[PDB]
Write a protein that binds this ligand. Structure first.
Ligand SMILES: CCCC(CCC)C(N)=O
Ligand SMILES: CCCC(CCC)C(N)=O
Lengths: 385, 385
């Protein structure tokens, strides 16, 4: 119960949450893994560079590991190693993990995941904080919500559409419910950066926003592409290849969410292939194979996929004007994330007072470079709060 | 044995082929249908208009029918009701159905299927010819090949890339093997129309081409989208919707064929969702539910999907110049196929000497409107041969 006490000004009741998947669901996962079939080998599945997606070799070995090496129980205990709670907001059950400080002056921060991630993405950073602070000295309140449609959060609604602004509104309400209406900071990557920008733009209690993703076109009023350094041009080139060769999954989520939702719900191996591809291609250094299995299993056991992808019709269907962040705005750049835009471009989308360049790390910043992201966020808060 | 005799000038021996799927394969299929999971209901899968893809209701109903009503054996007997053969070309096993005339002067025609179709698409046309003629009066040789990577054809190769031109080369060589080196005509729709175009462009034994698809953008020289009729502009808008809201599946096939191949091989429910969506959306009048079950089961049992999608790299990554059909060119227009372009546009892409416009019918012309397609084709052949 260390770090678990709600701040003094929270208005909601603490409802402690524990992950406890019944053995039957685990047995059924294994059964469905076993019954699943692998594609016959094809020219494309035999390409070791994986330019056409996951290889037969990888899927074959991952499937065997899932049946024989994988154990949910230690990962689950790890999920349960931090304080978690649920609360209801607009009739939605909203799950969140948290490290709450006992200091009255602690800066409230919400850290926002995306797809195919989750609240667990931030666990390595929570771990560093717990190794390095006590509840008495912890300088921040660290709130890690599950966004509507993900894992232990319910939703989105069945009877109406739901988008990025609805996600933002829920996050702000959580922060308000926990006692943070006088101010909070947002850390956001992936879909959480879209949500974080909206909080910065339109929500008075959001005082500052740090992002590790700024997906954007060339700014209308410049600077132009030719003003970019050779290295920044390499980044734009990587982004353009992502935008042309790497976005088909997102356009399927966007245009046919119901179809792909059913497709990936039918077999755990379908889900692994689709989500596994991104955990392979979107990082700098390869993740442990068990981490991929853990994340995919988490999605499977919570039926996350068909619920989570609603925002794709908004993210993958103004940054200088309507969605310009007037508040203190920070950015951490990791080169192997998918949209490596230059600082000069990012600077046009908000009041950029803080920028950190990194030599390594890909899309899953919190998982891949937890120290660098924690350090960057800490410096940002110390600068602007 | 009727209609099964190879022409006198064939250089290959007949190797008669029969579909015979073992009971164990059907048993495994049924079990995977039963134990594959369905997504929980979402806002998207509750949309009765299906704008987000297949609904929970449809998939649930189709699954119940697949388990309790579907029977592979009568469909299989139907496959086996026309002459079928295999021959080896470039180390590939090439399957084809056929009605061979005993008339020495019979016009050789190959009819080319696409995705998610197969040789059986042309069975209604073959039956109409069989009812109308005897082997001694049949005016055409009707060859219906299975393209590399589909159903009972093997391949494509595991050790090299394979594309549309390779498909054209295989078809042209099959026709030569069967004795038609002095000339043949091609009917093509879907991917078969891309292959059909390449045969008209680059293969001299191909004497004329009839297509029911001509996917293209506005021609440079004319006429402009402005001068088009109201009905033509409505067609342009349907095509434009297809290219923007309806193309994600193809972009996934194109960019990540290995991943989607494995996804859809993992569970027959996955395959049914992905392919069934297209059998629903691409037709004019709804097909019987059992037809979709039959088409999907045929893909499942032959592991067609991962092998067949190789051409998408080229079809979904010139028509007035390099790929202009200088040979007699014919076109059948069915309004609910996916790219309904004006006749004036089509005319810029070949020597268009034949055009038939239809009030009804969608993508799967041979299936949906067999009398119209057979009839258009006969008229075309008699005119140009
Ligand atoms: C919000 C959509 C962003 C993309 C990844 C690009 C960085 C995704 N998660 O599908
Ligand atoms: C070759 C791409 C054609 C499309 C349908 C549009 C007519 C398909 N079969 O994927």
């Amino acid at each position: 119960k260390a770090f678990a006490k709600f701040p003094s000004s929270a208005s909601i009741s603490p409802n402690p949450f524990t992950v406890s998947i019944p053995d039957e669901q685990l047995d059924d996962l294994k059964t469905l893994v076993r019954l699943s079939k692998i594609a016959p080998p094809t020219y494309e599945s035999l390409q070791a560079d994986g330019r056409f997606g996951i290889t037969s070799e990888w899927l074959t070995t991952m499937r065997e590991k899932w049946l024989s090496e994988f154990d949910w129980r230690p990962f689950e205990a790890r999920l349960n190693s931090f304080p978690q709670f649920t609360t209801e907001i607009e009739g939605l059950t909203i799950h969140f993990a948290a490290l709450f400080s006992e200091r009255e002056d602690a800066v409230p921060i919400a850290l926002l995941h995306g797809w195919p991630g989750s609240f667990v993405e931030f666990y390595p950073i929570l771990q560093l904080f717990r190794e390095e602070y006590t509840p008495e000295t912890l300088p921040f309140h660290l709130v890690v919500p599950s966004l509507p449609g993900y894992t232990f959060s319910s939703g989105p609604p069945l009877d109406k559409d739901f988008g990025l602004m609805d996600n933002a509104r829920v996050v702000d309400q959580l922060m308000k419910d926990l006692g943070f209406g006088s101010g909070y900071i947002i850390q956001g990557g992936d879909i959480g950066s879209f949500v974080g920008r909206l909080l910065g733009v339109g929500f008075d209690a959001c005082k500052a926003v740090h992002l590790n993703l700024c997906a954007m076109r060339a700014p209308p009023e410049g600077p132009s592409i030719e003003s970019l350094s050779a290295a920044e041009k390499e980044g734009i080139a990587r982004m353009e290849k992502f935008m042309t060769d790497g976005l088909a999954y997102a356009m399927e989520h966007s245009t046919r969410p119901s179809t792909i939702g059913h497709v990936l719900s039918s077999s755990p191996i379908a889900l692994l292939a689709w989500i596994g591809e991104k955990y392979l291609q979107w990082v700098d250094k390869p993740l442990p194979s068990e981490t991929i299995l853990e994340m995919v299993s988490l999605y499977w056991l919570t039926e996350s996929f068909p619920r989570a992808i609603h925002t794709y019709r908004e993210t993958t269907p103004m940054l200088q004007k309507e969605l310009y962040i007037h508040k203190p705005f920070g950015f951490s750049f990791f080169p192997k994330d998918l949209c490596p835009v230059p600082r000069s471009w990012i600077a046009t989308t908000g009041n950029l007072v803080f920028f950190r360049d990194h030599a390594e790390g890909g899309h899953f910043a919190a998982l891949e470079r937890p120290r660098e992201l924690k350090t960057d966020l800490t410096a940002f808060v110390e600068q602007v709060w």
